[PDB]
Design a protein around this ligand. Structure first.
Ligand SMILES: CCCCCCCCCCCCCCCCCC(=O)OC[C@H](COP(=O)([O-])OCC(O)COP(=O)([O-])OC[C@@H](COC(=O)CCCCCCCCCCCCCCCCC)OC(=O)CCCCCCCCCCCCCCCCC)OC(=O)CCCCCCCCCCCCCCCCC
Ligand SMILES: CCCCCCCCCCCCCCCCCC(=O)OC[C@H](COP(=O)([O-])OCC(O)COP(=O)([O-])OC[C@@H](COC(=O)CCCCCCCCCCCCCCCCC)OC(=O)CCCCCCCCCCCCCCCCC)OC(=O)CCCCCCCCCCCCCCCCC
Ligand SMILES: CCCCCCCCCCCCCCCCCC(=O)OC[C@H](COP(=O)([O-])OCC[N+](C)(C)C)OC(=O)CCCCCCCCCCCCCCCCC
Ligand SMILES: CCCCCCCCCCCCCCCCCC(=O)OC[C@H](COP(=O)([O-])OCC[N+](C)(C)C)OC(=O)CCCCCCCCCCCCCCCCC
Ligand SMILES: CCCCCCCCCCCCCCCCCC(=O)OC[C@H](COP(=O)([O-])OCC[N+](C)(C)C)OC(=O)CCCCCCCCCCCCCCCCC
Ligand SMILES: CCCCCCCCCCCCCCCCCC(=O)OC[C@H](COP(=O)([O-])OCC[N+](C)(C)C)OC(=O)CCCCCCCCCCCCCCCCC
Ligand SMILES: CCCCCCCCCCCCCCCCCC(=O)OC[C@H](COP(=O)([O-])OCC[N+](C)(C)C)OC(=O)CCCCCCCCCCCCCCCCC
Ligand code: SF4
Ligand code: SF4
Ligand code: SF4
Lengths: 145, 176, 155, 115, 317, 55, 70, 376
């Protein structure tokens, strides 16, 4: 009886994951077919799930978005689309989603969380943050006195 | 007190000796490791799904540096240079200047990660909690010049990483 | 269109390259033991499709992990040059990135890049097993973003 | 000639694999890559010096024993003869003779690695 | 006719390729890991990914190597493994062969020669030593393998592989020569160069043994060769002891039974690979010449007089 | 957290009750939402009679 | 989750399938339904020549029964 | 080499495969650690010891911490010492996990390596919970630990220690009873009683040889006197004995965890003397004395009186110690690191005699050579 119980669990798995198209989407992109409660959904389209019944370290997980700042990422992904409010929840630094209690919003925090800009033209470059220290004596503008 | 580890003379009894002989001829203790290994195969693997899934962390984690700022907006750093004096690899270089107003912070605040050790000493050395060890372990890059930040990006890092540390020091301000 | 065809063969080449690249079993210092930490079942090196091979004639990407010293230098360059192309190098930890905690030491070369070309600089000291496992991922993305036979077609 | 056809095909199919694995996948050699491997460093310089065995004694006994087994390969056909009586004694006699030779070598040291 | 040859050769290569996936995946599941699953569904696309990347990798020709010797050995290794798949009594053998096992045994000894030659052809310590450990490994198993081979089929009637199906028939052959199968199985382990007896490779001891200067395509033919060798000789031990029933009107009924017999047995080859440390080739020739040889004589004497014992001499035809 | 039949298989192949406690972690761990602490003062935190010359 | 192992076997088992019945099917096809006749001794081999000769179409695997004689 | 256990140049002059000479050229990793020690202050010098050996994170600065404050005539608070010994025993588990499994890795079978590195990672999980990072905590400092453990950490320690005893049995089932492991291991590499301590060996090297010596019992330090445990003593001095003592030390380590867990006392976490330990953050932002001390402590460092000391603790390998020599200023003058591996690798020539090339692979793992520590 338990054998067909796990068979219907797979049949539930394909049904609950948006039918066949969604299941093939997560199987070939999300690399996993597990189904979890919709804990939250940020402004970037990143879909988040929580399954407290699973063993530790596999309770809270993320399905990444297909679009971020014109950096189409339906197939390729990396561990940096996660916004700062949710990045602590994903790493279970805490047992609260930002939806339950949002972080203290202030003026200067970024409105669009970015990722590693390495390789892209938006990459950082080191530069002097100090002014000139020894400025030279400017030659006189007048001709021979 | 001590416990002797390796000496147990085997009994030469007919039953005991045929046990060792059966163990020798018929691989029995040998298949014991083989047999248990089967039992461990059926265990579900303890593998996370990176980056879709990330390992557990703690609020007092050391990652990339991020210069924070006061709720008004003024950056906390006040150029006491204690972080520079403590930095075990001298990854910090500090220059200061009184500019015009209540904002003389740094002429230069360069943190050199490929020199830095990630000891976090700068974080608790700061009297105003300006420089902190951020919770982001994920700041890899392709060029060597990338792996050093200027003062500006420390501000941008503190600006971009702001909600996480604000809550992290909120939970950890009594421990330290 | 010729560019369409070359792009398709380009897609075939890097996908095999980034899926089946083989890191070197090379380890020097504190970073090496954390490198095998993620190879442990918690993070599963192999589930991303890579396996550890030993000799230079065997592997794809050099994974430099640990402090680089003057005495270690001749062998590292010899072993790196001994790897057939294509070959990539990632630099574990602050020490191998450049200098590190012993940047000012007499017996430490300030940078593995001073000896061998580097693709990715994975920071942290030691880098957490999560961070470098992304470093492999970034190299998969970097391997994806090439036009080797495509630049040849327009060459 | 059926065995010839599969033998020819087999060695052919192997040769294509080495053929396109030597020309198609680029070529770039600059000496130190071409150099021998000594776990990172430069070899003492040889790979041709006498690598003297320490088990030379057992090697020749293998030749005697691998030879003598060829004497008892005809056993399946040797069973189906009208004279299994002397067949049993002679075939047994060979196995004791190998057993005695193994026993002889065993007792006078032999199989254990010569040092 | 050649259509039969390709259908005998081509599926083996894909089967060998998918052996690399299970090698890296059931081991991982047997090791708390999840195995390769990032490339396609559950990693089934990984064996393909290995194939092209190895082929497109740069071939390497060491300066001190003998060029002709460096190339002939990989050809010999892969060709023998592939041609090893023609004579098995898989329901309708490609070539009926009176001396089925002798054909099996002869080129199995020639297979190690490709293993043998590559060591010095690469011209270094780490391959010369691995090549010479191949000498001692085949010093041990060859002196006894023929004895086990003779003993098991002495009740069959002849050396023909096809008669194995007739001989077994009602009951599994292992039920009659179980201590021989104990002898035979792990001696095949000692020739395929698997974990307990892989001194020719020797991962930890000498980097890679007879592979150190090998790269790209030459390995691809070498990797497939030894993976083809283990599956084929496992299929050999499948028919040697676990031969199933064969209905002439429905030959496919034999294939489904035979395939699982050589497949579950293969899982064992991956099973020992995880659980057991490495034999030192000192005890390898020591063990196979101290206990293995004196024992295998005794049952060989047992298995010859015993057809005479009960008037159970098998017919040759 | 698997089927009972395989649980018997794992418990019999290894010959020990693994199901009582496993290598992987579950909800028996402490939650990571601890209440604020009230860390104690030290022995020398006495308001008087704490001259440095005596310690 | 060892049921993820089975897909590896599933294709592999099917991969081992092809040379099995094919070696039977091509034998069935090339010999006209009846299976491949084997000749381990002179009697069997001397037969195939006689069957090849008697058929009159130079095929050993086509057989003429009692209707051939009158 | 993967069997090289990192980096070293081990030249064998061997005939056939019997090693005649096995000169272990060391220093391929050399960092002038003691030289940079000279220019950094004691607080800046703490992370150095955390990076000597990559197997025992805070076992090392425990020796370094014991070097400083014991020279300083200062003692840590009783609660701090219990944290030190508790994590030192957890740290003792850390080395022994791959002191045996990576041994088995070079030996052959790789599955034991992946059995317990999962549990080794859990000890990393509490490591990161109570400290700043996973590996290099910089936690154990002179005068006491850096900060208090997070709430709920001890309960996780209890569960893990409860589950761990069921895992050494997993390794021991895999290896100890195994004949294949035994044949490659028993009587392969032996030391007599006299040459054991004549060669400067320590820890498991002596204990396997039957030498009745252990630093925890003979010369107790911190709160190790109150804890009760057993030390496994070998009978043959071969590789099998050392591996068996290493396994039994892990079991005895778990017993120490149980006693440490149930005997955690209340109180502070660092010496109340603010001149040696930084004051609390709340006091540093409010009181003058805390702020001015914090400023000068985090810009000069505590002045250590002139003198010399050779505090040595029971490292998981041997008797890892430091010959701290202070000139009286705020920075140390000379600090020479005693490495148990240094003596063990020195004796490697004596161990390998008549054994083959696979056996020397077994020996260099039975001493658990780590080349940031053996080399310094
Ligand atoms: C028996 C017939 C032996 C014929 C013979 O001369 O074999 C030489 C052959 C190669 O010797 P080597 O030590 O590799 O040196 C090759 C070059 O001299 C040294 O290496 P290389 O890189 O110079 O090799 C390329 C070289 C030599 O050519 C080859 O190596 C090509 C293959 C051999 C062609 C003859 O090419 C040329 O000289 C120009 C060829 C036009 O030696 C053998 O033992 C091979 C025998 C193969 C017999 C058939 C086996 C089936
Ligand atoms: C012998 C092998 C027979 C076939 C496999 C039977 C098997 O293990 O079923 C799982 C089933 C339960 O495994 P479990 O680890 O307790 O499942 C825990 C959760 O419920 C598991 O939760 P869950 O969410 O993983 O449950 C859904 C799961 C359930 O998956 C299954 O039930 C596997 C069967 C395919 C559906 O299906 C999936 O995850 C979808 C992916 C399936 C991948 C492809 C599997 C191919 C299997 C072979 C097909 C024919 C070739 O195994 C058994 O009950 C053992 C039966 C042994 C019968 C031997 C007969 C001879
Ligand atoms: C000698 C030469 C012979 C040449 C023959 C011609 C064909 C050779 C190559 C055939 C396979 C090509 C590769 C297909 C997979 C691929 O590259 O996918 C890329 C990409 C990889 O995408 P990706 O890069 O986003 O994947 C990794 C990142 N995550 C995990 C986050 C998603 O995948 C796809 O395109 C998806 C569809 C793949 C479908 C593959 C076949 C599935 C069914 C197999 C059945 C069994 C077959 C045996
Ligand atoms: C899915 C697959 C399911 C089936 C798997 C079958 C193989 C594995 C079975 C379980 C492992 C074996 C048992 C074990 O490890 O411990 C129990 C025990 C462990 O025994 P032991 O080592 O404690 O010694 C037993 C003897 N006394 C009690 C006197 C000390 O296994 C055995 O006793 C079985 C011995 C097996 C011998 C193997 C060779 C002969 C095999 C038959 C002929 C061919
Ligand atoms: C089975 C495999 C099926 C797919 C094979 C695709 C071809 C791969 C060939 C090996 C890589 C080189 C290549 O693609 O083009 C060669 C071309 C050769 O011309 P090239 O000029 O681009 O070569 C590189 C530049 N130099 C010559 C200076 C080194 O090289 C590249 O594409 C690499 C860039
Ligand atoms: C069949 C057996 C082939 C054995 C040689 C294989 C091979 O290509 O080796 C490389 C060798 C050498 O390859 P090669 O000729 O490309 O190497 C030199 C290249 N140039 C001349 C441009 C510098 O092949 C033949 O000698 C249609
Ligand atoms: C290497 C090739 C070895 C071939 C071999 O052993 O064939 C045995 C077999 C043994 O044959 P046989 O003894 O089974 O009798 C042949 C007739 N049947 C099969 C119907 C019973 O040899 C042949 O079949 C002979 C044909 C080939 C003769 C020429 C071989 C040249 C090999 C050159 C290398
Ligand atoms: S952790 Fe902070 S104080 Fe320490 S080296 Fe890095 S930046 Fe400097
Ligand atoms: S970051 Fe903090 S410690 Fe460093 S100079 Fe600024 S205020 Fe001082
Ligand atoms: S960067 Fe840190 S962990 Fe890595 S080798 Fe250097 S000191 Fe060790």
């Amino acid at each position: 009886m338990e054998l067909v119980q796990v068979l219907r669990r797979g049949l539930q798995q394909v049904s609950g994951h948006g039918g066949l198209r969604g299941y093939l989407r997560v199987l070939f992109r999300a690399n996993d077919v597990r189904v979890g409660t919709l804990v939250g959904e940020d402004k970037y389209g990143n879909k988040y799930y929580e399954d407290n019944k699973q063993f530790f370290g596999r309770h809270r997980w993320v399905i990444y978005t297909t679009e971020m700042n014109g950096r189409d990422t339906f197939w390729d992904v990396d561990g940096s689309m996660v916004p700062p409010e949710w990045h602590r929840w994903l790493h279970c630094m805490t047992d609260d989603p930002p939806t339950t209690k949002p972080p203290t919003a202030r003026k200067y925090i970024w409105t669009n969380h970015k990722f590693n800009v390495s390789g892209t033209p938006q990459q950082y470059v080191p530069y002097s943050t100090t002014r000139k220290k020894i400025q030279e004596w400017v030659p006189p503008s007048t001709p021979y006195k | 007190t001590y416990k002797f580890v390796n000496m147990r003379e085997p009994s030469m009894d007919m039953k005991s000796v045929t046990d060792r002989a059966a163990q020798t001829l018929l691989w029995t203790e040998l298949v014991r490791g083989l047999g248990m290994t089967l039992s461990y195969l059926f265990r579900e693997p303890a593998t996370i799904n990176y980056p879709f899934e990330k390992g557990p962390l703690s609020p007092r984690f050391r990652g990339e540096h991020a210069l924070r700022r006061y709720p008004s907006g003024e950056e906390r750093c006040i150029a006491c240079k204690l972080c520079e004096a403590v930095c075990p690899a001298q990854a910090i270089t500090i220059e200061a200047e009184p500019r015009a107003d209540g904002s003389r912070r740094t002429t230069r605040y360069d943190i050199d990660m490929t020199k830095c050790i990630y000891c976090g000493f700068c974080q608790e050395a700061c009297p105003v909690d300006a420089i902190v060890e951020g919770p982001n372990f994920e700041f890899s890059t392709e060029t060597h010049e990338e792996l050093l930040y200027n003062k500006e990006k420390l501000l941008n890092n503190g600006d971009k990483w702001e909600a996480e540390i604000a809550a992290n020091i909120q939970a950890d301000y009594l421990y330290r | 269109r010729g560019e369409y065809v070359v792009a398709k063969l380009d897609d075939l080449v890097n996908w095999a390259r980034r899926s089946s690249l083989w890191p070197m079993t090379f380890g020097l210092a504190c970073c090496a033991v954390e490198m095998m930490h993620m190879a442990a079942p918690r993070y599963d090196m192999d589930r991303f499709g890579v396996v550890f091979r030993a000799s230079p004639r065997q592997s794809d990407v050099m994974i430099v992990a640990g402090t680089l010293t003057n005495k270690m230098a001749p062998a590292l360059r010899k072993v790196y040059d001994q790897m057939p192309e294509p070959r990539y190098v990632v630099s574990m930890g602050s020490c191998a990135n450049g200098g590190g905690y012993y940047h000012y030491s007499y017996s430490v070369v300030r940078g593995c890049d001073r000896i061998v070309p580097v693709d990715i600089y994975v920071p942290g000291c030691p880098p957490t097993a999560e961070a470098l496992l992304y470093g492999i991922l970034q190299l998969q993305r970097k391997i994806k973003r090439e036009k080797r036979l495509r630049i040849w077609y327009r060459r | 000639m059926n065995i010839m056809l599969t033998l020819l095909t087999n060695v052919t199919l192997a040769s294509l694999l080495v053929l396109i694995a030597f020309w198609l996948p680029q070529l770039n050699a600059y000496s130190e890559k071409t150099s021998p491997y000594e776990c990172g460093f430069d070899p003492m310089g040889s790979a041709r010096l006498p690598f003297s065995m320490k088990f030379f004694l057992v090697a020749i006994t293998f030749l005697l024993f691998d030879l003598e087994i060829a004497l008892l390969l005809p056993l399946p056909w040797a069973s189906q003869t009208n004279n299994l009586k002397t067949m049993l004694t002679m075939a047994l006699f060979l196995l004791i003779l190998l057993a005695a030779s193994l026993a002889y070598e065993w007792t006078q040291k032999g199989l254990e690695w010569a040092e | 006719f050649m259509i039969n040859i390709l259908s005998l050769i081509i599926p083996i290569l894909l089967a060998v390729a998918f052996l690399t996936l299970v090698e890296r995946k059931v081991l991982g599941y047997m090791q708390l890991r999840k195995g390769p699953n990032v490339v396609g569904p559950y990693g089934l696309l990984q064996p393909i990914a290995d194939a092209l990347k190895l082929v497109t990798k740069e071939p390497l020709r060491p300066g001190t190597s003998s060029i002709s010797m460096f190339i002939i050995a990989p050809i010999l290794g892969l060709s023998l493994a592939l041609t090893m798949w023609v004579p098995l009594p898989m329901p309708y053998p490609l070539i009926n062969m009176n001396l089925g096992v002798l054909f099996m045994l002869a080129m199995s000894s020639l297979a190690v020669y490709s293993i043998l030659w590559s060591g010095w052809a690469s011209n270094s310590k780490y391959a010369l030593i691995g090549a010479l450990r191949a000498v001692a490994q085949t010093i041990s198993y060859e002196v006894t393998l023929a004895i086990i081979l003779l003993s098991v089929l002495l009740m069959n009637g002849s050396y023909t592989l096809s008669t194995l199906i007739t001989t077994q028939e009602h009951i599994w052959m292992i039920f009659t020569s179980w201590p021989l199968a104990m002898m035979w199985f792990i001696s095949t382990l000692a020739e395929t160069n698997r974990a307990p007896f892989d001194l020719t490779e020797g991962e930890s001891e000498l980097v890679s043994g007879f592979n150190v200067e090998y790269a790209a395509g030459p390995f691809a033919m070498f990797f497939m060769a030894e993976y083809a060798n283990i599956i084929m000789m496992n299929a050999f031990t499948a028919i040697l002891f676990l031969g199933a029933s064969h209905d002439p009107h429905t030959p496919e009924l034999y294939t489904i039974n035979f395939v699982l017999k050589t497949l579950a047995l293969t899982i064992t080859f991956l099973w020992i690979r995880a659980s057991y440390p490495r034999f030192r080739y000192d005890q390898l020739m020591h063990l196979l010449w101290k206990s293995f040889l004196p024992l295998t004589l005794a049952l060989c004497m047992w298995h010859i007089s015993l057809p005479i014992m009960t008037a159970s001499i098998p017919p040759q035809s | 957290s698997a089927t009972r039949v395989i649980q018997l298989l794992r418990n019999w192949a290894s010959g020990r009750d693994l199901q009582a406690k496993l290598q992987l972690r579950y909800q028996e761990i402490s939650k990571r939402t601890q209440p604020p602490p009230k860390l104690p003062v030290g022995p020398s935190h006495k308001l008087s009679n704490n001259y440095y010359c005596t310690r | 989750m060892w049921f993820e192992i089975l897909p590896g076997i599933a294709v592999m088992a099917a991969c081992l399938f092809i040379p099995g019945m094919a070696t039977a099917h091509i034998h069935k096809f090339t010999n006209g339904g009846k299976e491949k006749r084997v000749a381990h001794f002179s009697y069997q081999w001397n037969l195939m020549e006689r069957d090849r000769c008697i058929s009159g179409v130079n095929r050993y695997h086509v057989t003429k029964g009692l209707e051939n004689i009158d | 080499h993967p069997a090289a256990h990192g980096v070293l140049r081990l030249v064998m002059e061997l005939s056939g495969e019997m090693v005649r000479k096995c000169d272990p050229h060391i220093g391929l990793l050399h960092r002038g650690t003691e030289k940079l020690i000279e220019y950094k202050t004691y607080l800046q010098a703490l992370p150095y010891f955390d990076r000597l050996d990559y197997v025992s994170m805070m076992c090392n600065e425990q020796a370094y911490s014991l070097a400083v404050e014991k020279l300083l005539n200062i003692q840590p608070p009783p609660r701090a010492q219990w944290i030190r010994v508790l994590f030192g025993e957890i740290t003792r588990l850390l080395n022994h996990i791959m002191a045996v499994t990576t041994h088995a890795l070079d030996i052959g079978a790789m599955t034991p390596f992946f059995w317990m590195f999962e549990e080794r990672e859990k000890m990393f999980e509490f490591y990161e919970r109570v400290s700043g990072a996973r590996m290099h905590a910089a936690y154990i400092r002179p005068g006491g630990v850096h900060q208090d453990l997070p709430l709920g950490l001890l309960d996780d320690i209890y569960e893990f220690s409860k589950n761990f005893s069921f895992r050494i049995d997993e390794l021991e089932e895999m290896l100890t009873n195994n004949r294949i492991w035994r044949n490659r291991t028993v009587d392969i590499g032996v030391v007599t009683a006299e040459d054991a301590l004549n060669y400067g060996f320590s820890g498991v090297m002596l204990r396997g040889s039957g030498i009745q010596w252990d630093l925890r019992k003979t010369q107790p330090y911190d709160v190790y006197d109150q804890v009760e445990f057993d030390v496994p003593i070998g009978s043959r001095g071969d590789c099998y004995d050392r591996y068996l003592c290493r396994v039994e030390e892990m079991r005895q380590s778990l017993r120490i965890i149980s006693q440490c867990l149930n005997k955690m006392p209340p109180g502070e976490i660092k010496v109340d003397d603010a001149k040696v330990s930084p004051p609390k953050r709340a006091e540093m932002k409010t009181s003058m004395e805390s702020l001015i001390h914090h400023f000068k402590l985090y810009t000069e460092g505590y002045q250590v009186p002139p003198g010399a000391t050779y505090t040595a603790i029971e490292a998981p390998k041997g008797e890892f110690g430091v010959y701290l020599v202070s000139d009286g200023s705020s920075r140390p003058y000379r600090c020479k690191i005693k490495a148990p591996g240094f003596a063990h690798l020195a004796g490697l020539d004596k161990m390998s005699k008549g054994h083959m090339l696979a056996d020397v692979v077994a020996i260099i793992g039975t001493q658990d050579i780590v080349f940031g520590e053996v080399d310094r």
